[PDB]
Amino acid sequence: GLTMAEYFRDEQGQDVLLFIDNIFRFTQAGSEVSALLGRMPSAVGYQPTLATEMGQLQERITSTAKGSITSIQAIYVPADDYTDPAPATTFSHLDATTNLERKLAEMGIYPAVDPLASTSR
Amino acid sequence: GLTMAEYFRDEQGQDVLLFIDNIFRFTQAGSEVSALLGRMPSAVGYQPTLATEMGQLQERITSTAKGSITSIQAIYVPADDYTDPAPATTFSHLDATTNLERKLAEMGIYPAVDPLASTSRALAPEIVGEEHYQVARKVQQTLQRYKELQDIIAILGMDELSDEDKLVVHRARRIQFFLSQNFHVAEQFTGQPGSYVPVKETVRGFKEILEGKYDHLPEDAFRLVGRIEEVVEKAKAMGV
Amino acid sequence: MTRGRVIQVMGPVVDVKFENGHLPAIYNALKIQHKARNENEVDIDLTLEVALHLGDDTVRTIAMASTDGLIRGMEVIDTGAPISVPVGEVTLGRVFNVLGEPIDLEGDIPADARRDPIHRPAPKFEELATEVEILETGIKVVDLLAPYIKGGKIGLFGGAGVGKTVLIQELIHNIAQEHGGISVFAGVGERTREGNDLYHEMKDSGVISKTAMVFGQMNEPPGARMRVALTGLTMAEYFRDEQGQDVLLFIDNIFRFTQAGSEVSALLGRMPSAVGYQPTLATEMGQLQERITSTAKGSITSIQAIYVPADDYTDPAPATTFSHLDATTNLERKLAEMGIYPAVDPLASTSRALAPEIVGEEHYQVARKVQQTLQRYKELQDIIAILGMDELSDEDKLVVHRARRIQFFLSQNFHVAEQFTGQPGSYVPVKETVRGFKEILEGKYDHLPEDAFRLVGRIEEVVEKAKAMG
Amino acid sequence: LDAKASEHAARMTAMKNATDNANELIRTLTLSYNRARQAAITQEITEIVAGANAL
Amino acid sequence: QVSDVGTVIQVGDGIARAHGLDNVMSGELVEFANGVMGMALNLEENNVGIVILGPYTGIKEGDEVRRTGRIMEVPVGEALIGRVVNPLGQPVDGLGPVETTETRPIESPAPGVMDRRSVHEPLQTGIKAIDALVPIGRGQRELIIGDRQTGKTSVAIDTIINQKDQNMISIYVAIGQKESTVRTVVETLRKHGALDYTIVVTASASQPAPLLFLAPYAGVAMGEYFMYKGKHVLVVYDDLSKQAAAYRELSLLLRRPPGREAYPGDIFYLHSRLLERAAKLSDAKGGGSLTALPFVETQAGDISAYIPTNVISITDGQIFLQSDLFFSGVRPAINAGLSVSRVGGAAQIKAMKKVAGTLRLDLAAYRELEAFAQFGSDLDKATQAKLARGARTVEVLKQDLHQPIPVEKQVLIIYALTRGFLDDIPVEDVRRFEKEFYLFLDQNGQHLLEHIRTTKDLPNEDDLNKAIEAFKKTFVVS
Amino acid sequence: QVSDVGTVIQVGDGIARAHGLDNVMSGELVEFANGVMGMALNLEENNVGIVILGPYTGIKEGDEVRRTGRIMEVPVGEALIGRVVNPLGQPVDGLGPVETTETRPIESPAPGVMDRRSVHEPLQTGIKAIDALVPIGRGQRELIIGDRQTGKTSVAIDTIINQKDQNMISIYVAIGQKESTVRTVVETLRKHGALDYTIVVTASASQPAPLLFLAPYAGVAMGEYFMYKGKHVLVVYDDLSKQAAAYRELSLLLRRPPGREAYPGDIFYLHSRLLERAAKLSDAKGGGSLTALPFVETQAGDISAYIPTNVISITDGQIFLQSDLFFSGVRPAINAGLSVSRVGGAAQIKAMKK
Numbered sequence A: 001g002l003t004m005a006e007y008f009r010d011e012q013g014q015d016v017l018l019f020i021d022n023i024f025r026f027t028q029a030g031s032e033v034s035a036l037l038g039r040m041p042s043a044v045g046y047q048p049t050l051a052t053e054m055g056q057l058q059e060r061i062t063s064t065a066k067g068s069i070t071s072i073q074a075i076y077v078p079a080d081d082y083t084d085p086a087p088a089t090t091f092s093h094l095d096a097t098t099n100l101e102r103k104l105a106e107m108g109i110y111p112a113v114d115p116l117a118s119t120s121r
Numbered sequence B: 001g002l003t004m005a006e007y008f009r010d011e012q013g014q015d016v017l018l019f020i021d022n023i024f025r026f027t028q029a030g031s032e033v034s035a036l037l038g039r040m041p042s043a044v045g046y047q048p049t050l051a052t053e054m055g056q057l058q059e060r061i062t063s064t065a066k067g068s069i070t071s072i073q074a075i076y077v078p079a080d081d082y083t084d085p086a087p088a089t090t091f092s093h094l095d096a097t098t099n100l101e102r103k104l105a106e107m108g109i110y111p112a113v114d115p116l117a118s119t120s121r122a123l124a125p126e127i128v129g130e131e132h133y134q135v136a137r138k139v140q141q142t143l144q145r146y147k148e149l150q151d152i153i154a155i156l157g158m159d160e161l162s163d164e165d166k167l168v169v170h171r172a173r174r175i176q177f178f179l180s181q182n183f184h185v186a187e188q189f190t191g192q193p194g195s196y197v198p199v200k201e202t203v204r205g206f207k208e209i210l211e212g213k214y215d216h217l218p219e220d221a222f223r224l225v226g227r228i229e230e231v232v233e234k235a236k237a238m239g240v
Numbered sequence C: 001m002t003r004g005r006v007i008q009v010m011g012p013v014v015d016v017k018f019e020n021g022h023l024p025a026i027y028n029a030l031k032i033q034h035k036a037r038n039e040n041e042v043d044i045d046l047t048l049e050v051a052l053h054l055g056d057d058t059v060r061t062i063a064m065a066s067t068d069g070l071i072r073g074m075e076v077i078d079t080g081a082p083i084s085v086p087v088g089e090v091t092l093g094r095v096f097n098v099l100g101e102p103i104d105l106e107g108d109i110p111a112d113a114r115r116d117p118i119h120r121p122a123p124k125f126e127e128l129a130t131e132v133e134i135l136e137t138g139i140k141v142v143d144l145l146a147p148y149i150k151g152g153k154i155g156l157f158g159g160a161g162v163g164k165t166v167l168i169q170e171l172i173h174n175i176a177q178e179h180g181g182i183s184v185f186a187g188v189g190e191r192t193r194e195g196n197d198l199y200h201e202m203k204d205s206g207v208i209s210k211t212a213m214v215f216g217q218m219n220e221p222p223g224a225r226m227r228v229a230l231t232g233l234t235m236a237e238y239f240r241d242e243q244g245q246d247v248l249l250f251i252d253n254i255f256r257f258t259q260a261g262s263e264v265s266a267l268l269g270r271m272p273s274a275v276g277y278q279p280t281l282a283t284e285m286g287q288l289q290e291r292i293t294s295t296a297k298g299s300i301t302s303i304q305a306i307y308v309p310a311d312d313y314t315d316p317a318p319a320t321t322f323s324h325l326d327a328t329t330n331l332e333r334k335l336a337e338m339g340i341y342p343a344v345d346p347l348a349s350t351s352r353a354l355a356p357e358i359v360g361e362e363h364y365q366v367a368r369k370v371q372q373t374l375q376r377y378k379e380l381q382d383i384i385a386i387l388g389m390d391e392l393s394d395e396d397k398l399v400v401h402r403a404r405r406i407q408f409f410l411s412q413n414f415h416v417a418e419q420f421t422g423q424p425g426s427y428v429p430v431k432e433t434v435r436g437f438k439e440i441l442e443g444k445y446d447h448l449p450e451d452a453f454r455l456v457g458r459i460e461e462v463v464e465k466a467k468a469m470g
Numbered sequence D: 001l002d003a004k005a006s007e008h009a010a011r012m013t014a015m016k017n018a019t020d021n022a023n024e025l026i027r028t029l030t031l032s033y034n035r036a037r038q039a040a041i042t043q044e045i046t047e048i049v050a051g052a053n054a055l
Numbered sequence E: 001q002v003s004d005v006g007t008v009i010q011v012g013d014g015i016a017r018a019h020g021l022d023n024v025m026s027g028e029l030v031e032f033a034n035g036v037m038g039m040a041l042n043l044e045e046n047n048v049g050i051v052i053l054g055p056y057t058g059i060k061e062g063d064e065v066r067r068t069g070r071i072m073e074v075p076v077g078e079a080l081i082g083r084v085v086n087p088l089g090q091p092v093d094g095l096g097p098v099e100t101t102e103t104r105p106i107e108s109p110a111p112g113v114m115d116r117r118s119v120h121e122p123l124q125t126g127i128k129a130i131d132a133l134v135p136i137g138r139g140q141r142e143l144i145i146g147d148r149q150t151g152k153t154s155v156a157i158d159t160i161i162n163q164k165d166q167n168m169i170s171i172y173v174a175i176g177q178k179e180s181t182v183r184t185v186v187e188t189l190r191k192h193g194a195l196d197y198t199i200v201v202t203a204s205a206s207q208p209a210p211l212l213f214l215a216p217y218a219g220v221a222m223g224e225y226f227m228y229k230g231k232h233v234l235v236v237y238d239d240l241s242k243q244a245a246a247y248r249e250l251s252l253l254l255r256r257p258p259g260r261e262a263y264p265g266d267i268f269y270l271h272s273r274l275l276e277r278a279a280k281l282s283d284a285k286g287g288g289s290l291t292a293l294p295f296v297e298t299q300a301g302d303i304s305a306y307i308p309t310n311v312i313s314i315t316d317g318q319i320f321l322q323s324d325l326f327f328s329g330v331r332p333a334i335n336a337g338l339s340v341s342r343v344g345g346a347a348q349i350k351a352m353k354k355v356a357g358t359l360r361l362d363l364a365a366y367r368e369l370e371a372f373a374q375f376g377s378d379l380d381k382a383t384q385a386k387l388a389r390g391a392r393t394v395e396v397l398k399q400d401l402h403q404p405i406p407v408e409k410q411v412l413i414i415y416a417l418t419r420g421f422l423d424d425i426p427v428e429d430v431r432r433f434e435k436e437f438y439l440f441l442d443q444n445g446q447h448l449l450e451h452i453r454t455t456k457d458l459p460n461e462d463d464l465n466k467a468i469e470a471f472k473k474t475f476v477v478s
Numbered sequence F: 001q002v003s004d005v006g007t008v009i010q011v012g013d014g015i016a017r018a019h020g021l022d023n024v025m026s027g028e029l030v031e032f033a034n035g036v037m038g039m040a041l042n043l044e045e046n047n048v049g050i051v052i053l054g055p056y057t058g059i060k061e062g063d064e065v066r067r068t069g070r071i072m073e074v075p076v077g078e079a080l081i082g083r084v085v086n087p088l089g090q091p092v093d094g095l096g097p098v099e100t101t102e103t104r105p106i107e108s109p110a111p112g113v114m115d116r117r118s119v120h121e122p123l124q125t126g127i128k129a130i131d132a133l134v135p136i137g138r139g140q141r142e143l144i145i146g147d148r149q150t151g152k153t154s155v156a157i158d159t160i161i162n163q164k165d166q167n168m169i170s171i172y173v174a175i176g177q178k179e180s181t182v183r184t185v186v187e188t189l190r191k192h193g194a195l196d197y198t199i200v201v202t203a204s205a206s207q208p209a210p211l212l213f214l215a216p217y218a219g220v221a222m223g224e225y226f227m228y229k230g231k232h233v234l235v236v237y238d239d240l241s242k243q244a245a246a247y248r249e250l251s252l253l254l255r256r257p258p259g260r261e262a263y264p265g266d267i268f269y270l271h272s273r274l275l276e277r278a279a280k281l282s283d284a285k286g287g288g289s290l291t292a293l294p295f296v297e298t299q300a301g302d303i304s305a306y307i308p309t310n311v312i313s314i315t316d317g318q319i320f321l322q323s324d325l326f327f328s329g330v331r332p333a334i335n336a337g338l339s340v341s342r343v344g345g346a347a348q349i350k351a352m353k354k
């Protein structure tokens, strides 16, 4: 998907949106392939190269003088543990963060957009 | 032992009782050996073949058309952790389980059976009777409510409960004490002789306690008695 | 024939292949002295310690310094003995590293000086003393409420702001004055800035002339940070065994010793243990601690600063360390801010020796009574802070009156405090301090003001101070 | 007046008991937390080492 | 057939193994066929472990690797001032070649215990909440710790800008951040004019792990060149946690025995090596000094993790930043309770030392008596005044971005607050009073400002109180 | 020759591997060149794993190893009474050699089901609390458990002292204790006169782990000699926790996978086969007995830990010492709630029951 968007950015100078759903799945696929390739797992069973792979993906989404790509990414939080490596590594890459609070989600009040846990540059 | 019992179950058609003093040592020995056989370690250091070996042992202990084997097995729980793989895997092989608890043991409640965790497939209205089923469900409900009240009672006492919850606590403590019993074999630990309580008497006694017929007796009168009449016997001559 | 060659380098771990029939023993020290043959190499001056025999005539070693610049195949020399460090009077007033080389700029020790091995077995069963003795430190609070034992181990709990260095300096001064015994300071895993500050403090105080300092700092490899405590201990053992003295030994932080051992175990590739520590945790701690004992001719007494990870006293490292302790000293910020020096907590501090069998009935009774009175005063704090002193019961008023006297009399004017305060120091024998506390408890001095008891030493000086004020 | 004085005394004593109970509960929960922490660390490192020496 | 070349056996995940190179040094720098660099780390009996400092995908099994004969080193020199370079020294700003003439090895021994001097000079961060309660001195190494998005980078940028008039050289190391963030920071520095005495070292997230692992060492190596010639250098590390993560990746891929949380054995040795090279040199060696400000990331406020505990043990002090306090209007958000600086006092001027003594007690009293604040509005002797003063203190601690305050103005405002002059002005008028006070002072307080700047000591009580009372009368209460 | 001689190929951390030794049997004692003894643990296809029972610094790769032909065993006899020995039976008090004439194996089978008898004879400890609330009979295995500094050693010493007039032989086994404490304990016993009938087996903390691992077995083997001749023996282990730690260290050095709390799987079998050798024999077997008092140290008074629960599953009851109750001035701080004696009551004289 990112390769498809980069063409519209560089070649035609347009402005593009890239919607990626469940970054967590992208992390988990690598975490699965690492064991099969036979490498010693990280702290919570993730692959050693989690940060390197995630950086090599995320850092290609930038605005250059030719054009810009904006990306909206959904992330499932495993068991509401924000300390998991997959969301922890994501935090250092996002300009704006919207938190779908479980407290508002389970009390019947939606969209559960937390008015105060959200951060934005 | 299982082979010796299976002979009588199959060839002669006897009704056979089977007691196993500790079945957890079987899997413990399996784990002790597994490392040297070359197998890889499993989740908590157990052998990878834990479930299969236990299954292959357990499915032989069954009642067929030729005869009936009823098995009573004592299972050890390491470090009081009921989530350990050895106790966790044995649950699916049993019909009725009694879960003993150290906390109930320390309170002097014997036998220390947890009244909520213990289960049985035989507790159905069409097997034990509608009255028995109702009394059992009500006792469990009351004990569940008492268990939920523990945090409040510990943090700030019973002085700030509502009137209904205080009555719930009053019933629950007496019921919890009445589930204790004096065993025949505990004669050597304490000089008090044991007792044998029929199921009809048990049901009637718990029904009476739930109806509030003994709210006035002290809670210490219910400990280690047996029949409900012995509760009144003990309340008398105790200073009441 | 004592020539081997480097065959493998894996960071701190270096593997050396010796000729068959000439393998060095375990714990032996190997030296490499390589001069750059051409411009594509670097000079090497590196020392290794043997750890395992891997078979195939190969030795697995731990480096005592940075291994950068090694090339496979250069020559390695076997010394034929473990690391050896100089001992004697030459070590007093000097600063050394783990290898036994002087760090201070004063100059090196001649090669003809006597040197002893770092690794040696603990003293035998019959070489030990059969009885318990008290180490009279001359400090009132320590002597009364937490007595020290010749050959015992004492843990020191505290941090910054509570005069830990002042207490250490006063212990060194008092011991060297009244018993003739020297002290040794071993800086295991010490911050370099703090070590420099401590050196300057000791030079100012003048105790440097009667102590030896060994520093293994945080920037050094795990082998050095693990072995520095043992060279300090050897420097003390020389005086224990030859001079027959009562010697103090200070281990700067004994937790870093255990964690450096854990790192070395990980580097050597052994399986971890509970919470990731080395399998040999207890054995290593025992091999360090069992050499601090009292023998038939002398003793070594160790004061050890202990850090508790995550504030969990059940963590394996503190749990193993506490299996060897005989006393405890807690330094309290409350007391330090209130104005009590040396600010030792009279209640939290404990001692195994505080029993009538070891100390005596009178001392035991007086110490217990002082503890009870201070505990009662600690109880009344809230009702004092809320209602007011005059609102109390009469007996509680008497207890509060006496407790402040006791709290202040536990303070002392140290000799090393002279350079700032201008007041000469004092050494108080245990008999004098127990008698003084008995007098204060019996109500003999309820009429003196509490400020007469601030910093006096003996029981006569409080009377003199009150008489001088009015 | 007597009743009000009694009410404030009762509040003082009962609330003291409540605070003490809270402190004891915190102490016991902290001990449980430390045991759980040590167990988790041990299990993590054991699984990592097994997966490492598997090769 | 020579001992100075080799062939690659295994390629993958940014590391390689080569047959040959019999005479390579441990830690040497090596060169591959396509031109990417490498480092020899593991010298096995028959093969060499090489980590790759670049795009490895161009490497295939069977190509040739060559010696270079140099332990890894970086260029140093005053030409690097104002540039943006990677840890290898190659410029990335695009402004042509860097034009250096000198080199310094990455790993050099730290100064000995006998070459250091007690910290005695102040480092003016320009932040009131730091210069008041948590002093930092030249030669000190201080840990700045907080959760993600709390303001650590803003604090570092403010500190670096505030050194304009000082005789100090600033170095900023970026590990594992977005290139967009790094470019924004460079733009901000050039905008404020700090990019004529600053070097920026960049190792972004997409880069291979060894470059991230080596960036802080490149930073300290560049700083030490200025330090040893008699100058003062300030160094900032953005993520020691990302440093640790990169080293973990390298170690596991090289298959060394994994420890706790898969970290290699010598992770503490790595951070100690890094943070023990900052010191205040003794007078015989020279007047120079180096001060370091590592950063550490806390996962949801947890401070007991392995790497944060190591760094806390290593450094001389901590500054804690909290998201909730940041949300509550406390913009620099320093939790003054459990932050500490072990070098306090010697790292402060006389005036600040006099005026900051009272402030900590007042803030502590507010923090511990907060129990009567939310539930309150009841008469009391202390809390009715103690909480009132603590709220004013917390309001005064607040500051706005990219406006460092001179130390003398900090002294004056702290004196005013601690002497009770704020005790009647409304809490929402406290910040207005502070702004008006600085505006009033810049014209009506020369004999105070210059006196402080010249003597480092507090002015005369009479004159100072007279000026404060004049302004206090001039004040408007809303 | 490689039949009754071997050659070392690996040394490290107290574990050695030897080439050769074709005829050695599992569990045999092997003697190194410099006199240090070892035990043949694993007999692999081409190499033999040897556990070094002593200081291993003097052992070098290429050293010669010699068979002894004897299963791991220790000397026993009346000559051992009043002496202090290391687990191998060599005296350390410096009072000359020990003149025993016969030995017993370390690993010996326990008495069978039909060899035992019910416990009926009282063992008087001289402590009022124990003798009145938690009585102990001869042949019982009773556990003493509590945190550090709660008086466990003092309780053991008082029990050993009180046996002066009763017919009893006391064996005090010190695992992992400080040599200063062991010296002081020996002096206390000597002063009170308990060395007429006592043997002290010590393996201090500085010793290598295998000696700590072996010491309790040496003690029980020394006791069994008197037990099978019709006498009554008392054996005290200073703490099984430190033996368990030593065994965990040894297993992790041998690279066996760890289980709960990094302990090996056979940590239960380590203690069960030791505490199963204490029993009251039958009349046909001779009527002798062996009473064991193992000690276990807890952390913050948690009895739910792995080792405490394992040991509770083996013994016939436990005496729990309460740390804060001890801090309150009542030194024999017995937590009456958690202390029980399963085979008590029948093992108590008629006067005390009433």
Ligand SMILES: Nc1ncnc2c1ncn2[C@@H]1O[C@H](COP(=O)(O)OP(=O)(O)OP(=O)(O)O)[C@@H](O)[C@H]1O
Residues within 6 Å of the ligand: A092, A120, A121, E147, E148, E149, E150, E151, E152, E153, E154, E155, E331, E332, E399, E400, E401
């Ligand atoms: N003193 C201040 N005044 C005003 N705004 C501030 C101040 N300090 C921080 N902020 C704001 O707080 C937000 C986060 O600060 P900053 O960008 O420095 O994040 P950070 O904690 O360093 O995060 P990262 O982990 O992304 O590096 C920004 O919007 C910044 O403008």
Ligand SMILES: Nc1ncnc2c1ncn2[C@@H]1O[C@H](COP(=O)(O)OP(=O)(O)OP(=O)(O)O)[C@@H](O)[C@H]1O
Residues within 6 Å of the ligand: C352, C355, F147, F148, F149, F150, F151, F152, F153, F154, F155, F331, F332
């Ligand atoms: N019955 C007792 N009466 C008086 N004092 C006692 C008694 N028991 C113990 N103590 C005191 O408590 C101290 C505790 O030491 P002891 O070795 O007996 O206990 P412990 O818990 O077994 O110790 P450890 O395992 O740490 O060696 C004794 O040295 C003694 O001072």
Ligand SMILES: [Mg+2]
Residues within 6 Å of the ligand: E152, E153, E238
């Ligand atoms: Mg940042």
Ligand SMILES: [Mg+2]
Residues within 6 Å of the ligand: F149, F151, F152, F153, F154
């Ligand atoms: Mg003891």
